[PDB]
């Protein structure tokens, strides 16, 4: 189960960075739609926190060792962060979230595949459920942005 | 529509088609305002289901037989449905809902008049209460569209 | 690529819409001993069906599909058949009719399960699996009230 | 001297005005509550587990109508009947001794007949109030008539019949 | 002369019914400073009385008895006396009236306790003990409002 | 629906002043009964606020323009205010609330009559329901003062 | 010792409640016939109540210095109730009659518990049996009424 | 000893009453994209204003003062200006109006803080501090919707 | 019922002192187990307060006069208090609670007997119920201390 | 009371005696108004317990040792207790509560001053919040008694 | 036919019933530091075990099977062995016993997952996957309390 | 208000790292006490998140720009992270949390000081409330460890 543990830990790092990025969007948001999207980022952060709980606990349960320092999150995550900026528009902010979500969904697909190969059905299900809700958020964010989900 | 039972059945049919149109709007919606109006359509659907509950039950109680098949609903309703289209703008979608609600308000006024003439006070109140809430929604939808209610 | 998953999801949209209509008819026209228990039960079943429609229509949209969204489309595309309401149908007959609709839906869900699996769409696969599980549990209970085994 | 004291039969009845019908409702609802409670206690037969607690729900609904109508009567300056003697003597519903050997169909039919009477009384109260222009009282009777009639449909459906209002 | 538990339970059915009626009268005809607090309290007392009625009638039926279930039986079997409602009674007179009814109920509950105890019917015994405890607590509060000791 | 709109706006004005008077009674109350009636005035204010919501919204819904400045409320209201005074007795305060309520009940009856004549059944029901509740309050307030409702 | 009998009847109850729970579960599972929708979940309510008595009686036994039976074999061997294989063909009315019989037994067992604990001066244990008996007897009345009969306690 | 603390609390009583009236106007007359979220939001703001009114009026009465309690007193003592309701105002101008009212209240609360701090009335001082914090947080949000920095 | 009133009042005093001891244990607790037992003392204080409500109210209802000053509580209670001391171990603090509870249970048995002798069944049940729960706690505390209840 | 810890402990003692006095009032009350004031005393006791929680915990947190025996509360409190008396009038009882509350508010002001002096801002806030609420109660109690707060 | 899916569901009915009994024993006989947190935790574990029994027995009935439903059947078909209750067992030994019971259940659920997957009974397969996931999470926690790795 | 803003941002960084450390402790915990302290870390994280919300929001409100990347949190925080280790004893873990909390409390005192000095009363209150709760946790954590708070 080496690869299942590896992708779960990858998720630990990526979810940590994704939560940070979402927090930035939440904080620096400006433009029409703020009142609805500002708290929505908070909802998205709670959902990301949720996946982190599920995945980190599964990794520990499997005898793994979750990344657990900002240095490890940053260095292992494939997501890049930039300085907060109030001048970013609402469309740009939402587009950035969509792109973070597409990355997460692809990671979850890899997680699904890897765990399926090793026969780790519990881990497999964790990734399937997370991927489903994230893809649903992509649909809604894309709809707000006037586009098809284009998964 | 010669009596109370008849207008009640007309309502069962129109409310059923109205529910379907609302669902279409809910599903095919795209554009800024999606996050607010997509779930709002679900509230409107719940409200419509509520009137269908009141009116169908009253019809049954009066010894009537409610239309209870999609064919009957579609054929007896005076509302017309068209294929779903993601390209309809958010504002055109809301304008469509307003048209549907104006029709229902007029239907309810007719039910009010008919039941009143026949002295069916219970049925009369049902239409009055439904008309009141529907008209209030017309005001809010029109306001979002930057217009007066124009009842 | 997911065209078949999309088609079966849309098939479910049509069938679930017709099933909801049939359940409403049973709810309304029901008469006989047991009415007080089963009339409100139909409302629970309608909420359940609505839930499946939400899950499947949203997944279809998410996959880039276009859900049927008019009564004519639901009626023409659904394999279920509707009949005019009739107060003389017995309680047993009404429950048997619901069982028939539920067996059809359970069969439809197995089909959705199979198609999604074949196209590698695991999210859609799970949606059908969860819906099949709950609807089959209802068949057991309905059949039980009817003094019969589930006979899946 | 002192004023002579009139000695006459009460008679009356006469559901002349809103206050009179509201008070008639106070009496009829009180006896109806008692009858429902009897059906509740003496019920036996298949279906007991569902209809026994249902009578309790019907009792609560009756209690509610009693609250609305008695309070409106007081608000109008009336004096509600408030003794079992006044309830029993003024109500047109007839009570009999409780009996455990009545089928469910028979119990439910009795409730339906009690409800048909109340719906009729409510229609009378609606007509009288409307004629007097007492719109508040008018709405009270209309609302109670509506729910009571819905109950008749359900009870009748259990009995395998149409509402037949 | 209440021979057994069934007899005192049925006596309570009648007495609780009349007490409820009296409480309702006080609720309706109340006038004076304190109305805003005591008018609704009467409703609480009625609900409590209802509770005892539920517990005692159900126990009687469970024991194979037949509860009084008509106003005629309640009125005639009850020892409580009703009078026509009158808005000219003071708040303090109304409360004293309630205390009287409660003292009567408490005495009846003691009888039920003694009778059930002699019989060895501990279930019925507890019902009377519980009802008695709460009724006496109310007498204390009512009397306190009236500037008096409980004087049980 | 000229008159209906006019009496609805009259109510907007009167309900706004009535709320102010209730608040005064709430704040300046002193004497035995304070603990019960002080919080009760807050309940009354909420009910008045509720009628204000129903009536102003219906007026907007009908194409009207609700009074929405303190100047308009004071000048259009038939209710008169006086400086707060802690020396008014509890019973005088309650009598004051009763007079305000008798006025509103009268206004609601007029609103009912006007709306009924113009055939505005939704407006008519709003006034009827508000009158029903205000009159119940009058009975209770009078009962506390040891009097009959005297509607 | 002084409370040897109370402890023994509490333990007898632990065994009988455990087997009664098993029987109720069987009725819940194998039920078929008109009335299933109302009685199937009702059995679940009864199981919850039975479970509640087991909590009360086992805890009091432990509190008194006893050792509760806590293995299926002890439950089965000490209980006076007999179990039979599940059977879908038992009628709804036969199933309810069976529950009535189990309850009549529990009610009598609780009466013994009451008598024994009362004789030993264990008032706490006495009240526990009294409250349980009261509810089970109310259930016998309702089950019997559904079956068209008097409680016949 | 607390003359100025009482004066500023009473100033708040008038200003909050007028601010409430202005918020109600914005609530009623609002038209434009965003109505569905900002219309209800105005009711939230009105409830918060009511809250401040409750706190400040009660503190004033508690300190032995006499709160303004007539529309005339509110109107004449408040420094906020009201104008006739107008449906033709844009959503964005309505929100800009709300921001102005809030900037004013936040300034008044700062005055309330300074004055009460000067007289050593710590309870009153905390009331103004807590109120100022929330109003300021609302200014940030409103400004953000309007694409601007809070600019306190 | 002189004896029943007397034992009830004795309970008022002992429960008042027991509440103080429990509060002391709550405040001065130090050692492994603090996090679970500190809030537990709060639950015990609440239960004790409840018994005080029941017993003091019953005494008043019987025409008695409850002790209602710290002096009366201290002088009538058979429980002895000592100065708070952080040096007491968790296990000793729990053993002290057990000691107080054994006393309370013994007291309640005496109240049960006295009331039973005088025929005061209401008071009798109040003591029986309090005794039942206090003894259940003794079992649990003792179990935590690796011992049998030893009632 | 030379420091924050000393004044916090003084409050522990005074709050303990205040609770006892409020309980006495709750138990011995007789007279019109009982039904509303008897339960109100329970609310006040709950509020008093709340201040005790906050102050005792803060003292412990600062390294102090709270008074934790009835002897300490009674001897350290500046409040005096007398035997319960059913003949005290309702008004007299409420006036007694007012005097206890005036003492507590005065003590809280001293705690506020001492802590502010020592720079202990956390403790300072605790006294400020408690003073705010007790003064509010004094206003309502005085109001029921037909008087101004007279702080 | 789903022969083996039905057999493993019934094996679980037996094993869950015995596991519930063992957990109840640990619950009752527990003594030692940690009792206050672990005694009620056992109740939580029993409720969860109970839930799995509900799910698995219902699925078996739904599939046309016949759940074991007598203590004798549970005891004779279960692979778990029970011993007499003993208060002298330490807290840490009790938790270790629970871990052993849970390791067995987790293995049982893995077996049910594989068998159901083999036969194409995806509904049953999901039930076992869910149950296995939670039981394994508990093993991690229990082991952690015991100062050890999960060692699944 | 430059220094208030600076200390608020320092807190954003320190709170972010503190959250990460708490999470590590939560995940890697092993030893008797796990079942109570594992969930407790979750409560602490939630509380830490709350301060982050209050402080980041106030910083934005004052015209500041909050650190919003893991790199900034890690580089600006004075707290140091180490690789997760399952062998560390429970008592060692709790001692580590105490050290993080002692640092946070000192940080909040500094924040209180700079804001008081600048006249920024709102920010001052935020640090005061947060310092209060953190110090309360230090007492409990120390108590579990058999020690005085030693603030
Ligand atoms: Ca958050
Ligand atoms: Ca929906
Ligand atoms: Ca529905
Ligand atoms: Ca038929
Ligand atoms: Ca009832
Ligand atoms: Ca017959
Ligand atoms: Ca009532
Ligand atoms: Ca208010
Ligand atoms: Ca269950
Ligand atoms: Ca059969
Ligand atoms: Ca509002
Ligand atoms: Ca406490
Ligand atoms: Ca209390
Ligand atoms: Ca096989
Ligand atoms: Ca349990
Ligand atoms: Ca968390
Ligand atoms: Cl039939
Ligand atoms: Cl059958
Ligand atoms: Cl360790």
Curated annotation (Swiss-Prot), chain G:
Q: Where does Fe cation 2 bind?
A: 59
UniProt-annotated location(s): Cytoplasm
Which CDD domains does this UniProt record tie to the protein? DPS (cd01043)
Swapping residue 23 to L leads to an effect described as:
In strain: 849
**What molecular functions are annotated in GO for this chain?**
ferric iron binding; oxidoreductase activity
Q: Where is the signal peptide?
A: none
The entry's keywords: Cytoplasm, Iron, Iron storage, Metal-binding, Oxidoreductase
**Per its UniProt record, what Pfam families does this chain match?**
Ferritin
Q: Which residues cross the membrane?
A: none
E.C. no: 1.16.-.-
Which residues take part in binding Fe cation 1?
Answer: 28, 55, 59
Which Gene3D superfamilies does the entry link to?
1.20.1260.10
What is one process in the GO biological process aspect for this record?
A: intracellular iron ion homeostasis
What is the main EC category here?
oxidoreductase
Q: Which GO terms describe its cellular component?
A: cytoplasm
Has UniProt tagged this entry with the keyword DNA-binding? no
Q: What is the effect of changing residue 55 to A?
A: Abolishes the iron incorporation
Query: For this protein, what reaction is catalysed?
Result: 2 Fe(2+) + H2O2 + 2 H(+) = 2 Fe(3+) + 2 H2O
* Similarity comment: Belongs to the Dps family.
Known role: Protects DNA from oxidative damage by sequestering intracellular Fe(2+) ion and storing it in the form of Fe(3+) oxyhydroxide mineral. One hydrogen peroxide oxidizes two Fe(2+) ions, which prevents hydroxyl radical production by the Fenton reaction. It binds and incorporates Fe(2+) iron. Is responsible for hydrogen peroxide resistance. Does not bind DNA.
What is annotated about its quaternary structure and interactions?
A: Homododecamer. The 12 subunits form a hollow sphere into which the mineral iron core can probably be deposited. Can store up to 480 Fe(3+).
Domain statement: 12 di-nuclear ferroxidase centers are located at the interfaces between subunits related by 2-fold symmetry axes.
In Swiss-Prot or TrEMBL terms, this protein is called: DNA protection during starvation protein
Species of provenance: Streptococcus suis
């Amino acid at each position: 189960l080496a690869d299942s543990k590896a992708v779960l830990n990858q998720a630990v790092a990526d979810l940590s960075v994704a939560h940070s990025i979402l927090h930035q969007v939440h904080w620096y948001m400006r433009g029409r739609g703020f009142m609805i999207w500002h708290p929505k980022m908070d909802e998205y952060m709670e959902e990301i926190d949720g996946y982190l709980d599920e995945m980190s606990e599964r990794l520990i349960t499997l005898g793994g060792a979750p990344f657990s320092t900002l240095k490890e999150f940053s260095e292992n995550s494939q997501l890049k962060e930039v300085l907060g900026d109030y001048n970013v528009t609402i469309e740009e902010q939402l587009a950035r979230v969509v792109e973070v979500f597409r990355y997460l969904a692809a990671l979850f697909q890899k997680g699904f595949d890897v765990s399926d190969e090793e026969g780790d059905s519990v881990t497999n299900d964790i990734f399937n459920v997370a991927k489903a809700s994230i893809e649903k958020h992509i649909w809604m964010l894309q709809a707000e942005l006037g586009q098809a989900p284009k998964l």
